Each structure stands twice: as structure tokens, then as C-alpha cells.
């Protein structure tokens, strides 16, 4: 553009939400910087008693 | 019938073809009542004081006039411009004169709540006060656009003959009477 | 959701719609048994007026149940939500 | 013909028929329950 | 949520442009608030568990 | 089959006892005595067929979704917005239109989407992100709507106020607002309703920018809740506390509404006795709001079934004459033309040379 861009036109906010909720609900994470792809991190809380 | 009032006319628009090509630079050179800019536009602007009108003449030989109150006054002014061109030396002639538009307006002496009208005539009504205060009504018979305001004033445009303006007027009379 | 289908010969809803209410959903306090419908949901088959196909929510189980409480709520995406609590 | 749900945490008849988004009459609550039936159901005291 | 988020944001406090020297975008502090719910009129209310 | 065992049944319906399947028909109480079993999928583990699409077209689509993710509204807003966009991308004029008109055209479809869900959203809030300007984007907005002729609601008055009122900072203490400025939101929003309802019936809403009405009402409602504490404030002094930038018409709306409320004030003798004016009328709106429906019908001169004129300001100024019959007329257009008038519009060669020298 002939004039400076504004970051508010792109400063978006669904990414953090999606990542956090998907990791906690699905129960498997891929920390590809750390290079670990573990699963079975979460369990539903057993309300038998 | 209406409430004793028939719309007035505000403007006239007409065109005429002079039957020959013209040198715009010469006309602007020798006309006291003309303005022209060759480097950006292809037509010369001129005006006369009676009938108080303006004319737009291209090098192609066609002419557009506005400012008239009636079709006869537009035709008279167009003949006046043709005479002006003739005295400038060109073989100007008054041919195929035609009226193209005129504007009408009226008032009903009582206020109108536009929200109801847009709520009942969605197919024709536009109500965007934040963009333009007036309500826009696209009327189909005759092919006329009516502009309506809360004061009860109504404006009519888009006709080729005056009977179209008055026809749209009495067509909208019962609707606004509701 | 549409209400119970009444038999003109009886002025009473058909057996599979016996438990329903006028709104098309089951009534707390009442007694449901196998393959009776609980909600009478319908979807658009057209995906000129839209046509609709039946696809109810039915109870399937061994013994009867009683209906403890029925909840109705909503998200902000306009999606309605029903929940029911059955007891034995 | 009108239907009568009761609101959560205020329990005032909420009287909704149309397909409007669910809402209380005064509360902010979005949750409602159905009222009991008027048909009688017999039980076996075993 | 009370001392670690702040360090992790601190560790990445500034992003740098591709050109135009002294152009930069800086985080200075970050907050986490209290629970609330979306509603269909970009308006909010607190909620219970 | 379709038939019953021997006769004219035709329908086909299921039946089964213990996880089988059969065929119910009806002319007798029969399954047609035949049935069939079912074979099913599952115990394993919305098209593709996605066209490449014009590169610029999908670039625009990306703007569509990057816009709707700002407001973070529920997803179906995004998808249906995309659908409307694709529908609009089927005409030569839009394709050849400059990219700025494209940057605005994404905005309008998202806007009409929210209008369908009666989701409150205003004009500039969109244009904020689009480098646009009032005329550019409004003119274009009209163009597509008339082109598509789709039905779309207006901004309904009460909807926008909820999100507008909730944006203020008056609801908690802060170093900018000590408690005397703090107020309960419920009371304020109620009061604003009781004022805006007056505004519309008194013709004030119609044909004006709507937001100035809200600002004026909120300012005065906030004052009137603690007038002894708040009479000393002003428009900007109040707004900058809430970091709100105010309408300049809000002054016009304010003068208008005070003019209205003093005319209500005179209707009651026990208000009349105080000789109310601009300064004092504010601290009694709590009194007037209880009886406003009586005040209006005691105040208007228009007592007809269908002393003060209950009319919009456009003629509260009163006509200089009440529109006598216009002089609709014709003339003789065929007369001769005076050549002297024509020659007056011509420059002499001396004047021609003067203009040549000047040029
Ligand atoms: Zn409630
Ligand atoms: Zn048979």
C-alpha cells in the first residue's frame, strides 16, 4: 500500500482459544518444538461415588 | 381527488443535436457566457439568464440543457443556444429536440412516519437515516422515483412527461393517506 | 418439532406418540416404554416451500422408565438444546 | 394453546410460544424446565 | 496463571519489522480476568460452574 | 410386495422385535408377511471437490473470514458470509471494480449477515477496519443491495443500546472515577429506555443519526441519578472519563430534549411552582418519568383522535406561508428570439485579443 498498514486489521484471537480447548478436551498434545507427541493426558472425572 | 394541490416542477433536462461538428476552442474564445477546459473535458459549458438555464455542448454536436422549469422554456433556451452557436459562425441547426427529465415536488400539510411505510412497502422503500434522512420509494407505475420526508414533503423524479409526475402523485396519494 | 398425530377415529394420539405434549416433547411425570418417541424432531430434506422428513428421538431399552425432569435451553448460535432425565 | 415453562432460579411462568431465543421475563437466565403433566399415573406399593 | 504467564510473555516482549528501522510492536503487561460468557450482542455476564 | 400377501396395500414401513428388521404395510394389520434384514456400516475409523478458484477471489475470501474473526461471532456467520460473497462474485461490474470497492464489499455482506440475526452493529464499526470513508462505502453499499434486492431489517432502536451502554466504565470504581461517578447499570439502562421511548414518539428519532440520541440520554440519566453530585459536569468532561468520544449533534439533542422536558414540567402545578429552567429541571426527571404518559397528553395541542405542537422540528419552525397552490403553468415557447441578447453573449475581437493576451 501507499500508506502504512495497521495491525488491528489482522491481530486475531481465535488461535489461542482453539489450541487451548482442543488440547484439554482431546487429551493429546504435539509440542513440536519440544518434539513430543504424548497422549492420554486427560480423563473424565469418575462420578461413581 | 387530491387535497387541492398538484405537484410543482423544479427542474427540466433536455437534449438537442445541432447537426454539425464544432470547434470548442473558438467558441470558448468568443463567448462571453461560456466556460471550457480542453485539457480535461470534451464539452463547453454555457449559460443564459432567461430562461435561466445552462447548456453542455460537445465537439460531437450533441447538447444537454438543464435549469428549465418547463419543457417550453427548455425548448426556447435550446433554440437560444442554437442561435448563439449560429452567430459564432458554425452551421448550427435546431434538430431532434427532446426533453429527457424533470423534477417535481409537493407537500401534504401533515407529518408522515417513515418507519411504518418501510415496514409495509419493503419492496419499494429504503430507510437508512444514518446514510440519507429521506426515504426512497422506487415506484413502478409510472417508472418514477419518489423521495419522502417526515414533514410530508414529497419529491418526484424520472419522468419524460409531466403526466407521469402527476400520475405517480395520485398513485401515492392513497398509500400515504393510509 | 411438530405435535402428536391424532387419530380422527379416536381424537387421541397414536400409541407411539402417546407420551408427547402439544409442543412435541415428553411430559414430566409420565411413563415411557420401549420404542416410543421422546422428541419429534424433523429436518429439511431440501437442505418451492421446504419439505420435511421425519427423524424422531426414540427411547430404546429393556424396562420402562419414568421421566424426572425436562430441560430446555439455548446457545448463542441459535441452536436449541433439550435434556431429559429418566429414572428406574 | 400457549405453553408454560418455568424459569430457573426464579420460577415465574415464562410463557413462550414463538421461535424466539430462549429468555426469562426478568432474569438473565437462559434455562427453563417443563411443568408436570395433569394426567394421573398409578403405582404399585410393593 | 499468576507468575509464569508473565515471565513467558516477558521472554518474547518485542517483535521486529522486515524494514523501516525503529518500527516495532511491544507487549508490556498481560492480564487474565475472571470467568464470563459470550452472548449474541457482544455483551457479557459472569457464570457459575 | 408393496401389495399385502395378496391385495392392494402399497406402503412400506419397518417393524422388528429383537434386533431384526421387517416391512410394515397397511391394508390389513400385516407386515406383508415378508420383511427383509438390514446390512450396516460402522466399527471403522460436506464435499471435497474444491475448485481452485481465482487467486484474487480466494484472497478476498480470506479477508471475509479475517473480518468475522475480529468480532469472534459464532461460526455460522463466517460460512454464510462466504456464501453471500460468492453470490456477489458473479457479475462483470464487481469483477472489474477496483480493489477498494472489493475491500468494502466484504464488509457489507458481513453487516447484512448480522442484521439477519438482528445482531446489533453500526456503520463505522465496520468501516474502522477497511480504510473506507462514509461516501465510498455507503454509495457502494446501496449499489449491491439494489443489485441483489434482498430483504434486510433496519437497526432496531433498543438493540444497539445494550452493547453501547455496557461499554461505559461507570460500573466500577477506578482512579479516574471515584464512587460519586460510579452508578448501577440497571437503573441507567432503564432510565434511557424511558427517555428513548419519548424520543421516538416525539418525532426526534426519525431521520437522524441514531447514536447521538443514546449519548444525550445516557449523559442526562447518569446526571439525574445523583444530580447533587453530577450537575457540575459537562458533555466532554463526562465522556472522557468513560474514554468516549461524543457527537457534536448531542448538543442539539440535549437542547431539544430539555426544551421538551420543561414543557412537560409546566403541566404539573407542584412542578410548576418551582419555576423550573435549564439548571433545575434535571433533578426532577425521576418525578416526571412516573407520569410522562399523562404529561404528553396534557401538553400536546394535537388532541385529535388521529397547547404545544406535537410535531417534528422540521415545521415546528412553522412555514412562512402554508404552501399555497403552486403556479403550475405553461408559456408560449415558439416566439421569435431577440438577437440583441445573443450578441451580448459574444466577445468583440478586441475582447478576444484581450483574452488572448491574458492567456
Ligand atoms: Zn426468571
Ligand atoms: Zn390381503
From Swiss-Prot, chain B:
Its main location: nucleus. DNA binds at residues 11, 47, 62, 101, 138. Keywords: Disease variant, DNA-binding, Host-virus interaction, Neurodegeneration, Nucleus, Repeat, Spinocerebellar ataxia, Transcription, Transcription regulation. Widely expressed, with levels highest in the testis and ovary. GO terms for cellular component: chromatin; cytosol; euchromatin; female germ cell nucleus; female pronucleus; male germ cell nucleus; male pronucleus; nucleoplasm. GO terms for biological process: DNA-templated transcription initiation; mRNA transcription by RNA polymerase II; positive regulation of transcription initiation by RNA polymerase II; RNA polymerase II preinitiation complex assembly; spermatogenesis; transcription by RNA polymerase II; transcription by RNA polymerase III; transcription initiation at RNA polymerase II promoter. The keyword Protease does not apply. It comes from the Eukaryota. Sequence repeats lie at residues 9-85, 99-176. It is found in: Nucleus. GO terms for molecular function: aryl hydrocarbon receptor binding; core promoter sequence-specific DNA binding; DNA-binding transcription factor binding; enzyme binding; RNA polymerase I core promoter sequence-specific DNA binding; RNA polymerase II cis-regulatory region sequence-specific DNA binding; RNA polymerase II core promoter sequence-specific DNA binding; RNA polymerase II general transcription initiation factor activity. Belongs to the TBP family. This is TATA-box-binding protein. It comes from Homo sapiens. The chain holds residues 159 to 334 of 339 of the full protein.
Swiss-Prot record, chain C:
Disulfide bonds: none annotated. It is found in: Nucleus; Cytoplasm, Cytosol. Transmembrane segments: none annotated. Catalytic core component of RNA polymerase III (Pol III), a DNA-dependent RNA polymerase which synthesizes small non-coding RNAs using the four ribonucleoside triphosphates as substrates. Synthesizes 5S rRNA, snRNAs, tRNAs and miRNAs from at least 500 distinct genomic loci. Pol III-mediated transcription cycle proceeds through transcription initiation, transcription elongation and transcription termination stages. During transcription initiation, Pol III is recruited to DNA promoters type I, II or III with the help of general transcription factors and other specific initiation factors. It is linked to Leukodystrophy, hypomyelinating, 8, with or without oligodontia and/or hypogonadotropic hypogonadism: An autosomal recessive neurodegenerative disorder characterized by early childhood onset of cerebellar ataxia and mild intellectual disabilities associated with diffuse hypomyelination apparent on brain MRI. Variable features include oligodontia and/or hypogonadotropic hypogonadism. Belongs to the RNA polymerase beta chain family. This is DNA-directed RNA polymerase III subunit RPC2. It comes from Homo sapiens. The chain holds residues 790 to 887 of 1133 of the full protein.
Curated annotation (Swiss-Prot), chain E:
It is found in: Nucleus; Cytoplasm, Cytosol. It comes from Homo sapiens (Human). This is DNA-directed RNA polymerase III subunit RPC2. Component of the RNA polymerase III (Pol III) complex consisting of 17 subunits: a ten-subunit catalytic core composed of POLR3A/RPC1, POLR3B/RPC2, POLR1C/RPAC1, POLR1D/RPAC2, POLR3K/RPC10, POLR2E/RPABC1, POLR2F/RPABC2, POLR2H/RPABC3, POLR2K/RPABC4 and POLR2L/RPABC5; a mobile stalk composed of two subunits POLR3H/RPC8 and CRCP/RPC9, protruding from the core and functioning primarily in transcription initiation; and additional subunits homologous to general transcription factors of the RNA polymerase II machinery, POLR3C/RPC3-POLR3F/RPC6-POLR3G/RPC7 heterotrimer required for transcription initiation and POLR3D/RPC4-POLR3E/RPC5 heterodimer involved in both transcription initiation and termination. It comes from the Eukaryota. Belongs to the RNA polymerase beta chain family. The lineage of its organism: Eukaryota, Metazoa, Chordata, Craniata, Vertebrata.
Swiss-Prot record, chain F:
One of its GO terms (cellular component) is nucleus. Zn(2+) binds at residues 4, 7, 25, 28. It holds the Pfam family BRF2-like_C_cyclin_rpt. The modification Cysteine sulfenic acid (-SOH) is found at residue 314. Residues 96-102 are annotated as: Interaction with target DNA. Sequence repeats lie at residues 60-145, 161-237. The keyword Transcription applies. One of its GO terms (biological process) is cellular response to oxidative stress. Changing residue 314 to D: Impairs formation of a ternary complex with DNA and TBP. A zinc finger (TFIIB-type) spans 1-33. Induction: Down-regulated by epigallocatechin gallate (EGCG) treatment. GO terms for molecular function: RNA polymerase II general transcription initiation factor activity; RNA polymerase III type 3 promoter sequence-specific DNA binding; TBP-class protein binding; zinc ion binding. Residues 310-316 are annotated as: Required for the formation of a ternary complex with DNA and TBP. Residues 318-359 are annotated as: Required for interaction with TBP and formation of a ternary complex with DNA and TBP. It is found in: Nucleus. The keyword Chaperone does not apply. PROSITE patterns: ZF_TFIIB. Keywords: Activator, Metal-binding, Nucleus, Oxidation, Phosphoprotein, Repeat, Stress response, Transcription, Transcription regulation, Zinc, Zinc-finger. Belongs to the TFIIB family. Component of TFIIIB complexes. The TFIIIB complex has two activities, alpha and beta. The TFIIIB-alpha activity complex is composed of TBP, BDP1, and a complex containing both BRF2 and at least four stably associated proteins; this complex inhibits the transcription by pol III via its phosphorylation by CK2; YY1 facilitates the TFIIIB-alpha complex formation. Interacts with TBP; this interaction promotes recruitment of BRF2 to TATA box-containing promoters. This is Transcription factor IIIB 50 kDa subunit. It comes from Homo sapiens (Human).
